[PDB]
Amino acid sequence: ASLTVKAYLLGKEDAAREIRRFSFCCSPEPEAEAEAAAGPGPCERLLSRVAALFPALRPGGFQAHYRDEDGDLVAFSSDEELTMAMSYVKDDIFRIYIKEKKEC
Amino acid sequence: ASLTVKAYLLGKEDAAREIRRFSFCCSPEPEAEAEAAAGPGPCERLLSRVAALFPALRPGGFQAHYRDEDGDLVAFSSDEELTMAMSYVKDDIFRIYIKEKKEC
Amino acid sequence: ASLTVKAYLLGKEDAAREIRRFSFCCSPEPEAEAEAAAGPGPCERLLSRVAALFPALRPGGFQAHYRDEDGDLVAFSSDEELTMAMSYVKDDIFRIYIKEKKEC
Amino acid sequence: ASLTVKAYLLGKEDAAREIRRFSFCCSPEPEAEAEAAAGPGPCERLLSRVAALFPALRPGGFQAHYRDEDGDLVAFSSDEELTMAMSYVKDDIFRIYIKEKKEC
Amino acid sequence: ASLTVKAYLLGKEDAAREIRRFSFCCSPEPEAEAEAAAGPGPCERLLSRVAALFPALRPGGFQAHYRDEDGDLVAFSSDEELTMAMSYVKDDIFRIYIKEKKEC
Amino acid sequence: ASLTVKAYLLGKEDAAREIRRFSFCCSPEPEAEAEAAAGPGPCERLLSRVAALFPALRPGGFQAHYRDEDGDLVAFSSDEELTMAMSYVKDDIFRIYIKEKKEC
Amino acid sequence: ASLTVKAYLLGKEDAAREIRRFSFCCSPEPEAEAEAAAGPGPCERLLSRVAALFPALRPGGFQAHYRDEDGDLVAFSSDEELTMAMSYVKDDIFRIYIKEKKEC
Amino acid sequence: ASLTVKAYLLGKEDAAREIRRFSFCCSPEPEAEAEAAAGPGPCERLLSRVAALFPALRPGGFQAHYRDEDGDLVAFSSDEELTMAMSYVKDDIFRIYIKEKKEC
């Protein structure tokens, strides 16, 4: 399941500041034997890869979102919630919206 | 009865600060034999799950609401009152409005 | 006679602080034999149920009101006066206005 | 694989200020023995050549982009991302869009 | 079940031309023995009474409506559909909207 | 599965001429023994009921539609296609759009 | 591979006259043993299903198209050409455009 | 060298009547040993494949063209002239223009 993720980085008034467009492999998985318990999570591997590409942000300091049917930026941080996020993929493009974690 | 709950977290002037959108299983219930008296309540399981998702709040310190026909944020804390709250579900989306418990 | 009571709790400048919206069963009554003299009163059962729902008030320390045709908050504490209060029900919603009993 | 790169240098309101049009040799490679580990990268050789031609910019201080199917200026800085950039070549012209790195 | 019917007679651009406000006795019924099969229908008695009051219309030549939650003038002509019309009564006022049957 | 069908009857420029709003029982079914092969179809029972309510149309001479995500009036006449029509129900309201079968 | 086909039927000035929206199973295939040579073709099964749904056309008398990147209605009739047609699927919707075979 | 050929079939006033868009393998060639003298020619294989796809024409009765820099439909029938035709390929699309051979 080759899945393209188009990571929007949002700015001041929720206008996009930098777009990245990488590829992601959620349903694919490594070798079918346990070298660990079971890897990282599918949302933990996503946020580890969004943090690796953008130079403008550091890992652990950003909140990834998506747009639902109402147009609202629904956040996601879990991997049982990333599966609800990915039911909104249009063609193969999973558009996420990155916002940084400021003061309050 | 798969039931989607869209938890709005309200801010200063009752504007939404963070939206979460999980799923909830009120009318479904576990195995039909008593390992306890009867579980937690259907409102106790709801507020235990709203507190588990949001990192910005801690359990026991938030008041969940809903909008009635007048547009007012009617609160609910009981499970005989959650059944009156859930007669306002539109499609399958049960929109609740979370407010934190401050000083006075 | 299923009758919905929307209990407004008034605040500083008679602005509503918490709304509750329960259901009430005035004209319905229990089994048609005397286990007591005749229960509590229909206003005594109302004020016992308004005190049970709100955590912010304690029983015996609040004055329930209603709005008449002039817009004035007419109080009621009797059960021969609750019958005059309930001649202002609009659809099935009996809006009462709760005020607490302070110093003077 | 002779590949023409048409380097647009963008200005104030993303209008082109200077166009350069050089040639690039991504899939071609030098002698088939290791005088080093493996050269520079195919994106490192591209940005070293865009910086060599334009007198108006200095190396390390510009962000190269491309247009995707949505019309958005998707940036690229990696060489596993330059391979996704180059799947948008039209005839043999790989149009990149240069933007300088200002204050914030 | 005393039920007030406020019959709006609509005009050119669906503006009310004459309002009548009578009373109606749907759930009440005559003597509990069959002098006929079972009377007229509860919608047949309604349209026979709307035609009796208005001098501007003649029976069989008008279409009675109601407003649903969307604001649309939903028509009704059956008595299994009048029961769905009467689930929109607000206090005890059942507002119907009369339109005459013209050419096409 | 109580399911409300709001039958729009379209006019000249696809503007609604008469709206009907009945109820429909697709997934419910009669007694669990065969008095026939298996009844009519779930789309055959729907179009038999839309034709029964509207006086302005006669059975066999109308095409029922629905709106998909693109806003287009997708027609349906089969009962393996009515199941795809009914995946667009919003709350419990299944809005169909009736058009009559004219010359060409 | 569940694949939705949205069959536009074109009219006089290539404006759509009737839209159908069925589902298609190209890459899925029946039991893995030969009851025949190898079924019909994947384009022969498509045109047999488009002809089965539309009442306005008869099989063998219509030309199915698709839109390429230029906006042109490229026809297809082969099954080595249907595989080039299906590289333009957007989400899972394979929009074909039906035109009938008239005089000349 | 995968090469896409978009075969326009021209009509009365040189307006396109049917477009076909197949793929062609000019510079690729079969096994590197002589089962014949040397196959057909690269223009003979092209015109044998254009005649195989279009049902509206028969082989030997059509003239394939291309557009040069002046906008003129330059014909080609040789395979030392097809190599001059294919120096006008834009991305990988080799647009030819088919005209049938009528009376005079």
Residue numbers in the entry:
A (entry chain C), B (entry chain B), C (entry chain A), D (entry chain D), E (entry chain U), F (entry chain V), ...: 2 to 105
Task: Give the authors' words.
The selective autophagy receptor p62/SQSTM1 is known to form higher-order filaments in vitro and to undergo liquid-liquid phase separation when mixed with poly-ubiquitin. p62 has a key role in selective autophagy by recognizing poly-ubiquitinated cargo and delivering it to the autophagosome. At the early stages of autophagy, selective autophagy receptors like p62 thereby bridge ubiquitinated cargo via conjugated Atg8 to the forming autophagosome.
In order to improve our detailed structural understanding of purified p62, we determined the cryo-electron microscopy (cryo-EM) structure of full-length p62. Therefore, we recorded a full cryo-EM data set at pH 6.0 revealing long and flexible filaments with a width of approximately 15 nm. Due to pitch heterogeneity between 130 and 160 Å, we refined a more homogeneous subset with a 150 Å pitch and 13.6 units per turn (corresponding to 11.0 Å helical rise and a −26.1° helical rotation), including dihedral symmetry and obtained a 3D reconstruction at 4.5 Å global resolution. Consistent with the class averages, the local resolution varied significantly from a well-defined PB1 domain scaffold at 4.2 Å resolution up to over 9 Å for the more flexible regions. The cryo-EM structure revealed a left-handed double-helical filament with two antiparallel strands of PB1 domains in the full-length p62 assembly. At lower density thresholds, the ZZ domain envelope emerged connected to the PB1 domain, albeit at lower resolution. The densities of the associated C-terminal domains were weak and poorly resolved as they did not follow helical symmetry, presumably due to molecular flexibility with respect to the PB1 strands, which is in agreement with the assigned structurally disordered region in residues 169–33821. In comparison, the here determined full-length structure revealed only two well-resolved antiparallel PB1 scaffold strands, resulting in an open major groove, while the previously determined PB1 domain-only assemblies had one or two additional PB1 strands inserted into the closed helical assembly. In the full-length structure, the space required by the additional 340 C-terminal amino acids restricts the assembly to two antiparallel PB1 strands, leaving space for a major groove. In contrast, our full-length p62 filament structure was solved at pH 6 in order to obtain a more homogeneous closed filament conformation following the helical symmetry.
